[PDB]
Amino acid sequence: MYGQAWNQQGFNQTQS
Amino acid sequence: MYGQAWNQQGFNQTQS
Amino acid sequence: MYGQAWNQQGFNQTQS
Amino acid sequence: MYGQAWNQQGFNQTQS
Amino acid sequence: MYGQAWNQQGFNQTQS
Amino acid sequence: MYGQAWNQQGFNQTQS
Hints:
By secondary structure, chain A is largely without helices or strands. Chain A is about 0% helix and about 0% strand.
């Protein structure tokens, strides 16, 4: 590989 | 591979 | 491969 | 309305 | 409205 | 509205 790779497992915005 | 690859498992926006 | 490949398993927007 | 509605204009994965 | 609505305009993963 | 709404314009992972 010659690049960049994230793995965003989250992003969450919970309520109640 | 000569590129970039994420794997976003999340994105979630839960409520209640 | 000479490119970029994600696998987005999520996207979800749940409610209740 | 009693629900939830996104409008995802993107999704794009461009190359070159 | 009684819910939740995003508008994701992006998502992009450009190269070169 | 009785909820939560983001607008993620970004997400980008550029290269070169």
